[PDB]
Amino acid sequence: QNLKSTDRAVQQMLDKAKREGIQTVWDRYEAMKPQCGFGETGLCCRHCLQGPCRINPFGDEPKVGICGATAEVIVARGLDRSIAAGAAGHSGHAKHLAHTLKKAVQGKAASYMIKDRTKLHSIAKRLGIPTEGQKDEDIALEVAKAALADFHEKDTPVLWVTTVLPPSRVKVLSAHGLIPAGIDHEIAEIMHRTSMGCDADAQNLLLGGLRCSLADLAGCYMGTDLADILFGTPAPVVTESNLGVLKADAVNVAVHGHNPVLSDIIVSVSKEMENEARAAGATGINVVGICCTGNEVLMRHGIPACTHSVSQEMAMITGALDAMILDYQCIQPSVATIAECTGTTVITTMEMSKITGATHVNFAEEAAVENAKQILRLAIDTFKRRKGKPVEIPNIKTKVVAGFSTEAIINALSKLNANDPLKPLIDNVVNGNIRGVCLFAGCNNVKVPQDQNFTTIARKLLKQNVLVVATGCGAGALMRHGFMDPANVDELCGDGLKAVLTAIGEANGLGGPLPPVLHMGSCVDNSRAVALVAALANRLGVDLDRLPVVASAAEWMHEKAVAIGTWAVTIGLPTHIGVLPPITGSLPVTQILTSSVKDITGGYFIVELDPETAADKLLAAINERRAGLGLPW
Amino acid sequence: QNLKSTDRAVQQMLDKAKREGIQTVWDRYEAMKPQCGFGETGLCCRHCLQGPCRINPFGDEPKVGICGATAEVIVARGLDRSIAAGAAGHSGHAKHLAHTLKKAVQGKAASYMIKDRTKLHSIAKRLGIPTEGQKDEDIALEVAKAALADFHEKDTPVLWVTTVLPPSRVKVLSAHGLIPAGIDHEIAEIMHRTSMGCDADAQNLLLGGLRCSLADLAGCYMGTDLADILFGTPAPVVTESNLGVLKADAVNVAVHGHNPVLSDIIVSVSKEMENEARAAGATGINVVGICCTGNEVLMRHGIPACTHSVSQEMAMITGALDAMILDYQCIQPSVATIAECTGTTVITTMEMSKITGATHVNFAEEAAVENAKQILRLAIDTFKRRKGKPVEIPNIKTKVVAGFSTEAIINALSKLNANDPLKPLIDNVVNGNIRGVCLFAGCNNVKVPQDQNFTTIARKLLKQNVLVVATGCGAGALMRHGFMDPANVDELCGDGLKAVLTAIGEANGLGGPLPPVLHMGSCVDNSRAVALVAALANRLGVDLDRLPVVASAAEWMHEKAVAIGTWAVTIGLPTHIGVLPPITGSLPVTQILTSSVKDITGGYFIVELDPETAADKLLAAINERRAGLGLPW
Ligand code: SF4
Ligand code: SF4
Ligand code: FES
Ligand code: FES
C-alpha cells in the first residue's frame, strides 16, 4: 500500500477497504490501465462531431485532424480549455463570495458580516475606492460591486490583476496583450477561439491561455480578499492533521469542497449544538476538514485537517465519519457510493454541484443558520445509528502550526524591524541564510504515490536553506508528514534557514521557531503567495522574474491547478510540474511552455517526474536567480 | 466522388484535387478511420490529469472514471462543454457587433452607422428602452449597452431570452430554473460544474446545459438584431450559388467565417476599387461568399454564394480564388496549407483567430475602409500573379431567391391580409394546405455525403406540403441543389404548398411563386425562425410546443450547432439530428434527451441517421402536433 500512498493512516485504511471489498480511487486507476496514449500526449480532439480525431505521436496516418488541425493546434486548444475550466472554478468561487458580501451589507443575510474592517479598507484603497467619510457597508458594497464588475468588459481591465501585481510586471504583460479584460469574458473567448475552425496558431492560442490564466489569478485573489473581509484574515494557529483527528465518541462532521461561505457557518453553529449532540450520546460535534474548505477553516479557526485530495475516501472507511458536507470542486463522486457501505451521510449544498445518491440540502445565505442546523441534525441522527459499533480510526496525527496569511508573515517579520518588515527577510536572502522561496501548490494525483513528490522535494530544499510556503493539497501533504510542526525544524532545516525561523519565532514570543513550512492557506490563497512575492519585488525594486522564487505543483491534477501553474509562469516564476500534462504530443508547444515563454514573461515550466531531480532543477532555477542579482549561491 | 458529395461541382473539384495530389477533408477523414469508439460514444473524459479515463460501452473494466464519475456523468459533462463552446462562439460574435454599434454611435468608427432605424426602434421598445424624444444614437447607445449587460449577472435575467419568447414559454422555463442569468456567466458556470469533482448528477448537469443553450439563443438573437441595425434587415433578393459564380477574368474574393462586421465593408469597398482591379487586367472584383458570412452578405446584398462548410477547400482548387478573407468559426485551417498549391491569398483579420501560414491583417472598425483596401490590394496582386494561367471553374450554378427575414415574410404575407399578416399562414395550416413548418439548420459533416440528408428530407417534406425554411449550411445545401429557385416549385412542392407559395408570390407582384424553401439567413439568423414561430404561437394563443413546427440539424458538426439543436429542444421543438453526438454510451442520458425532456420543455431530440426515416419521423412529429390542436392530418 506504500506504492499507493506514503501516508501511514491512508495505508491502514487501504487495508480495511481491501478486506471489506470497497473499491478505491487506486483500484479504479488500476482498472483504467493502460490509459490512452493519444489522450496522455494531448493528440486527441473532440471539438466537433466530425471527431473524434487523433494524431499518431510517431509513424503513419493519422497525422492531422479532419479539419486540418495540426498536432500543435490540437495540443494548444486542449490546454487552453483546461485553463479556462480552472479559471471558471476559481472565479465561480469568488463570484459566490462577492454576492454573499453584497447580501450581507444590504441586510439580506444576517449570518454574514464585515469581520475584517482593516482588510476591507486596505482593499478599497488598493482599488481606488474612497474610504474617508464612508460607512463600512457603503465601502463594502462598492468593493463587492467592483468584484462583480471584473467579470465582464468595462472601462478598466480586471483590477484584481492590475492592482495586485508590481507595475513593472503589469507593463510587461500589457506589452504582450496579456491583461484580462473581464474574467468570464476571457473564459468565453477561450471556448470560442478553441472551437472548430477558429484560432489555429499555437503561439496565438497559448498567448490567449496565458491571459486566461491571469483571469484565474484574479479569481483567486478576489476569493481570498472577500473571504478575509467576511470571515477574518488568518493569523498563526495550532491544530492537528490526519485521520486520527476523528473521534469515535463524537459526531464527526467533515466539511469538504472549496467555498467556506457555508463551512464557516457550520463551524460556528456546531458550537451552538454541542448539547443536542450530547443528548444523543456523543461528546460533542467534531468538525474536521477535507481539501480546501478544510484549509479555509483550519487557517481561520484551527479546525483540524482530516485528509486531502486523492485519499478523501479513506476518512469514510474508518466507519466514524457521520457526515460529509460538500460544496463544490475536487469531491470524488465515488463518496456517494462508498457512503452506502460506511454509513456516512453525504450532503450536497450547491445547486450546480449535486451527486446522484447524496442527500441535497439547499443552502441559502439568507437561511444559513437554519440550513446548518438541518445538516448537523442529519449528522447527529447518523451518529446515533452507529452508537455501540466498532470503528477503525488510525491513531496517527501530526501537530500543525498554520495561519500564515501574508499579513501574518509581515506582522511576524515586523517584530524584527517594525518600520521595514520585509527587510529582515531580504537581508537573509542576500546573506545566504535563505537561499530562496519555493511555493508548493496543487493537488495529489493517483499517478504519484501520495505525498512522495512533495515531501521528497521539500526535504532537499529545506536542507539547502530554502524558505518553503505551501497551499492546498501541497500544504495538506506537508502538514500530514510533520512539516508544519516546529519540533521538526532541527531535523529538517538547514542551519541558515533554522536561524531565521528561530529568530522570527522567538521574536514573536514563542520560545521556539516558526514551523519548517509556512501554511499559506487554500488554493485560492495561492494569491497570498503572490501578494508576498509582489511585496518583496516592490521592496527590492525588481520584477518577479528577478526574484529567487520558484513554484512546484509537484503532484497536480485539477484544471484549477493547470490554471495556477500557468499564471505562476505568466507572472514570472520558474514553475515545476510533477505530472505530465497533455503536451508531449507537440514539440513546438512543449518548447514554448518550457523555454521560449521565458522571453515573454520570464517564467517557464520545469517538467520533471523524478522528485529528486525536480529538487535539483528547482535549486538550479533559484540559484540562477541569485546569480542574476549578483548574490553568492 | 458521389460517396463524398452530392454536389456535382464539388465532385469535379475532388477529381482535380486527386490528380494534383492535394489532400482534402475527405482524405483526412479516410486517414482517421477507424475513429475511436470511446470518443464516438462519449465514454471518454480528460477533465483532469489523472486521465485520460474511458469506460467500455459493454463488458468488463474500466466501468467508471478514476474519480468515480459514471458513464452518465461523463457523457453529460462532455455534452455540456460542447453547448458552452457553441454559446461562446455565437455570443462572441454578438459581443463584437455590440461593441461596433457602440463605437459607431459614439463617433469612433465612421464606416459604421444606424442603417435600419425601424429595427432599432422596435428592438428598443421590446427591451423597454424609451424612444419618444430621444436621438437615434442615444437609443442605439442604450440598445448596445443593454446587449453588453446581458453577458453578466444583473437585476434582470438575459433580456435577449425573456423578451423574445412567448410569455407562456418564459414561465415554463422559469419554473424549471432554465432562464440564463448572464451569457458569459452561464458559459463559465458550465465549465465550472463540469470540472473534476463538481456536478455529478446527469439530470442536474443536463438542466444546466439547457440553460446554457438559451444563453446561446440569446447570442444568436442579439447578433441578428445588431447586424440588422448596423447593416439593414434582409429583404427578398435574387442571386446565384455554387462554384460557377467564380469568374476566371475577375479578382475573385471570398468572404469566409461568420461575422460580417468586416465583410459588409468588403462588399461596399470592393465597388469603390473596380477601377484599380480593371487597371490590373481584371473585369472587376467578384466578391463571393463562403459559409455564414457569405450568407450574411447574400441575404443583405445578393452576393452570390460560392460554397459552404465541408466543401470550402474546393473553391480554392479551381485555381481562380485570389483571396479568402477570414474572420472566425468553421474555417478549415487546411486552407492555409492548400493555398501554397492553389496560389490563393488567405487573410486572417481577427486577433483571436489566426492560422499559421496565413497573412494576418489587423482589422479595426475605426480603420475598416483602410483595412479593406489593403486586403483587396493583396487580392488584386494575387490576380496579377495568375494572369494568363488556366483555371478549372465548374460551369455549375443555381438561381437563388433569398432574403426572407421574418420582417420580409410578415410583409409578404401582409399583401394577403394587411392588418393580420400571420392569419393567411395559419389559415392554410388549419385547412391543410400547409402541413407544418420545418427549419433546416446546421452544418455539413464529412461523415455524411454532402447535402444528402438535407435534400432527401426536404424532398419528402415538400411533397407533403411542409413549409420549409433554412439557415446556415442547411440553406447552403438546399440553395446549391436548386431548392431556392421558384422554377422548381412545380417539381418539388405538394399541391397545397404550391398554392400558398404561388398566392403569396403573386400578391407580391412576382407573377410567380415564392421559392420552394425560404432562406432565413446565417446560423445566428436561426433566431429569425424563433421570431416567426413565436409570433405564430402568440397569434394562436399557444406555446411553441403545441405548434406543428419541427427542426432538423440533418448533417450537423460544430459545437455551435449542438447549442442550436439544444435550444431548439429547450424552446419546445421536436428536433431531428442526423449525426450521432457522443451520447450513446449512456442510456440514461439518451433517454433524457430523446424522451423525458418532453416533460420539461415539450421538445425532444429525434436521432435518425437514415434521412428517409428521418423525414417519416419529422412528418410524424408534425402530425402529432396537428392532432393535438384538433386539426386533420
Ligand atoms: S475540430 Fe478538427 S480536429 Fe477537432 S474533432 Fe473536429 S475535425 Fe477533428
Ligand atoms: S475528472 Fe474523473 S473521469 Fe475525468 S479524467 Fe479526471 S479522474 Fe478521470
Ligand atoms: S483517442 Fe483516447 S483520449 Fe481520444
Ligand atoms: S479514448 Fe479515444 S476519445 Fe479518449
In the block, which residue shows the cell 480603420? B367
d(CA B88, CA B252): 32
Give Cβ neighbours of residue A86 (< 8 Å, ≥ 6 apart). A213, A216, A558, A559, A560, A561, A562, A563, A564, B195
Asked if A196 and B32 come within 8 Å (Cβ–Cβ), the reply is no
Residue whose CA lies nearest to ligand 1 atom number 1: A196
Geometric angle at alpha carbon A336, from A332 and A338, rounded to 5°: 90
CB pairs under 8 A between A and B: 318
Q: Which residues of A142-172 are buried (b: 16+ CB within 10 A; e: fewer)?
A: bbbebbbbbbbbbeebbbbbbbbbbebbbeb
Instruction: Write the CA distances from A208 to A185, A201, B84, B252, B398, integer angstroms.
Output: 12, 11, 18, 33, 42
Nearest to A225 by CA among A177, A164, A180: A164
Distance A54 CA to ligand 4 centre (A): 8
A422-431 helix and A526-540 helix, angle to the nearest 10 degrees: 80
Question: Radius of gyration over alpha carbons of chain A, in Å?
Answer: 24
d(CA A264, CA A327): 12
Residue B342, sorted as left (phi over 0), alpha (psi -120 to 50) or beta, turns out to be alpha
Distance A309 CA to ligand 2 centre (A): 13
Residue in A closest to B93 by C-alpha: A192
| Identity of the amino acid at A334 | S
Distance B44 CA to ligand 4 centre (A): 5
d(CA B494, CA B491): 9
Asked if B182 and A184 come within 8 Å (Cβ–Cβ), the reply is yes
d(CA B530, CA B167): 14
C-alpha cell at B539: 397569434
Residue whose CA lies nearest to ligand 4 atom number 4: B44
Which atom of ligand 3 lies at the shortest distance from residue B36's CA? 1
Instruction: Write the CA distances from A226 to A91, A525, B320, B584, integer angstroms.
Output: 12, 11, 60, 43
Cβ of A39 closer than 6 Å to ligand 3, yes or no, is: yes
Helix extents (H) in A68-158: 71-105, 117-127, 136-149
d(CA B260, CA B262): 5
Chain B hits for A148, Cβ within 8 Å? 152-153
Q: Is A306 annotated as a binding residue?
A: no
Task: Please answer whether residues B318 and B396 qualify as being in contact, where contact means their C-beta atoms are separated by less than 8 angstroms.
Answer: no
Residue whose CA lies nearest to ligand 1 atom number 2: A67
Distance B217 CA to ligand 2 centre (A): 30
Residue in B closest to A49 by C-alpha: B557
SS3 A21: coil
In the block, which residue shows the cell 446581458? B150
Nearest to B444 by CA among B555, B578, B355: B555
As a whole number of angstroms, the longest Cα–Cα distance in chain A is 72
d(CA B624, CA B633): 9
Return the residue in A38, A184, A330 with the most chain B beta carbons within 10 A, the one to mutate for interface testing. A184
Which atom of ligand 2 lies at the shortest distance from residue A32's CA? 8
Task: Please answer whether residues B545 and B171 qualify as being in contact, where contact means their C-beta atoms are separated by less than 8 angstroms.
Answer: no
Helix extents (H) in A432-488: 452-463, 472-480
Which DSSP letter does residue A320 get? -
Cβ of A426 closer than 6 Å to ligand 1, yes or no, is: no
C-alpha cell at A626: 541569485
C-alpha cell at A126: 488598493
Return the residue in B43, B64, B191 with the most chain A beta carbons within 10 A, the one to mutate for interface testing. B191
> What secondary structure does DSSP assign to B427-479, as a single string?
HHHHHTSS-EEEEE-S---TTS-BTHHHHHHHHHHHHTTEEEEEEHHHHHHHH
Q: Which residues of A30-68 are buried (b: 16+ CB within 10 A; e: fewer)?
A: eebeebbebbbbbbbbbbbbbbbbbbeeeeeebebbbbb
Geometric angle at alpha carbon A298, from A292 and A301, rounded to 5°: 135
Residue whose CA lies nearest to ligand 2 atom number 6: B48
Task: Please answer whether residues B186 and B211 qualify as being in contact, where contact means their C-beta atoms are separated by less than 8 angstroms.
Answer: yes
Q: Which residues does a 6 A CB cutoff place in the pocket of ligand 4?
A: A 36, 39, 44, 46, 52; B 36, 38-39, 44, 52, 54
In which order are the strands placed within the sheet that holds B549-553?
B517-521, B466-471, B436-440, B549-553, B574-577, B604-607
Q: Which residues does a 6 A CB cutoff place in the pocket of ligand 2?
A: B 45-48, 50-51, 53, 65-67, 69, 74, 196
Which ligand has its closest atom nearest to the C-alpha of A561?
2
Q: Is A45 annotated as a binding residue?
A: yes
Which DSSP letter does residue B287 get? E
Task: Please answer whether residues B197 and A93 qualify as being in contact, where contact means their C-beta atoms are separated by less than 8 angstroms.
Answer: no
Cβ of A54 closer than 6 Å to ligand 3, yes or no, is: yes
Q: Is A292 annotated as a binding residue?
A: yes
Asked if B46 and A78 come within 8 Å (Cβ–Cβ), the reply is yes
d(CA A166, CA A172): 10
d(CA A278, CA A284): 6
Task: Please answer whether residues B28 and A64 qualify as being in contact, where contact means their C-beta atoms are separated by less than 8 angstroms.
Answer: yes
3-state secondary structure A224-254: HHHHHHHHCCCCCEEEEECHHHCCCCCEEEE
Cβ of A281 closer than 6 Å to ligand 3, yes or no, is: no
d(CA B148, CA B151): 6
φ, ψ (nearest 5 deg) of residue B473? -75, -15
Task: Please answer whether residues A254 and A290 qualify as being in contact, where contact means their C-beta atoms are separated by less than 8 angstroms.
Answer: yes
In the block, which residue shows the cell 438561381? B399
Task: Please answer whether residues A503 and A471 qualify as being in contact, where contact means their C-beta atoms are separated by less than 8 angstroms.
Answer: no
d(CA B391, CA B320): 6
> What number of other Cβ atoms are within 10 A of residue B339's Cβ?
22
Residue in B closest to A336 by C-alpha: B68
Question: Radius of gyration over alpha carbons of chain B, in Å?
Answer: 24
C-alpha cell at B125: 421598445
Which DSSP letter does residue B358 get? S
The number of helix segments (H) and strand segments (E) in chain B equals 27, 16
Cβ of A52 closer than 6 Å to ligand 3, yes or no, is: yes
Provide long-range contacts, Cβ within 8 A and 24+ apart, for A56-65: A57/A584, A57/A585, A61/B31, A61/B32, A62/B28, A62/B31, A62/B32, A63/B31, A64/B28, A64/B31, A64/B334, A65/B28
Distance A299 CA to ligand 2 centre (A): 29
SS3 A607: strand
